[PDB]
Symmetry: C4
Subunit: 142 residues, 4 copies
């Protein structure tokens, strides 16, 4: 399965609602299981630099089937994936990207959020992904 545009827009609206509740102005990106952009929403007032980061976060999450901050926990100096961010035209490995997982457990795309603290980004991404699916893959080696 691929994330449909209807699903992507529902997730964007759920994410935007959580952003407004937290008092934030976010960029919200949805990509499909190929990393290709499916939908994008820059809230009024959101940081311009967050446009690229939201899309890179979604890409990173779908490229590896993992929330972005979980990759960053492995890519610190000394870590097993130090330097992974150079790959794939640039990854983002701090929180804000979350895989979207369909009913039969397959990853159909991902959401990426940027524009506030990384903790607020994660909470907004989670609200957006949870409105359309499960958000986690089991048995991940990382």
């Amino acid at each position: 399965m691929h994330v449909t545009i209807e699903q992507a827009e529902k997730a964007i609206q759920a994410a935007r609602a959580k952003a407004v509740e937290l008092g934030t102005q976010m960029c919200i990106a949805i990509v499909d299981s190929g990393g290709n952009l499916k939908a994008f929403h820059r809230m009024d007032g959101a940081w311009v630099g967050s446009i690229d980061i939201a899309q890179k976060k979604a890409k990173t999450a779908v490229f590896f089937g993992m929330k972005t901050g979980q990759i960053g926990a492995l890519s610190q100096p000394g870590g097993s994936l130090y330097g992974i961010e150079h790959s794939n035209q640039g990854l983002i490995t701090f929180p804000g990207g979350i895989p979207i997982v369909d009913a039969d457990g397959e990853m159909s795309g991902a959401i990426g959020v940027s524009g506030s603290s990384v903790e607020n980004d994660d909470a907004v991404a989670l609200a957006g992904a949870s409105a359309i699916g499960d958000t986690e893959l089991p048995d991940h080696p990382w």
Copy 2:
């Protein structure tokens, strides 16, 4: 996009004057609120590598509404923004970029300065931005 070419040039001159006072040779860049280049001045003798750095600093500051070194305080190993410099075709997160903030409290652009120690870079940037507005 609100910073005028008149204001950009005034900031460059206030920055150049602070640079001469500190004994430095600087590149100075002004970008608008979208990160697009508005004005640029390379003092004679400035390091060639500072041309790109000053522009990236100005871009970085306006992309996030923060002085560049304040982003670097969060992007160290173990920091919440570790790796952010890979975004946006390359950020610079040590001092030298400062938001330009108009009287309405809206950010209209940013200045970026490179060519000396990062302390002098930030002093020169601040002199320029403060000539045409607030900086936070």
Copy 3:
């Protein structure tokens, strides 16, 4: 003294068989001694992100004649090669790239593997490289 396509495909099928034995889904790249792509195989279900990583690992290994993780051991903060990953359109310096060394001890190419833990990546790369030659200069 360049890996042939028959050797590249032998190395890919050996790496793939090791991958399955370990329960993994890998991307496996073979490059030549110039770093140019020779063969590629993305196993069904492999991480999309591992496509680029497997190729960069093979390139990195052949660009310096050593296993990728040995470079990473030197490119930590404070290490002699800190920042090397910015060169060559991007290196990968965690395990999974191994050089392919001919009979007379000359490097003819490299293998790169991505898609699981880095230790599983190295194990699968070694199975692939060892099937067609030596693995060290």
Copy 4:
């Protein structure tokens, strides 16, 4: 600006030092704008050192410093952390040195890659010392 006569003399001095040390190096010369003036890849040198030698030469001339002097400042917690993202990629470990003319004006830089960074720096110094300070 460094002349091609000077660039080639620096490459030959660097090459001779590299052979003395048993190394196979890539040697690059750039002008004061960072544009390539000469390049020499010794037989058997690491293919990856082609790009690194050139980025080292560019880095040294872009800031008027030896490359490793910049890396000393760009560690975590250092004042230049992240600088390598600039200028399409810098190299900040040893092997790049400025070429400075009789007066203290920088005319170019040399960049060397292909061995340990210490050997890289010794070979670079031999080349740059052959034609100036």
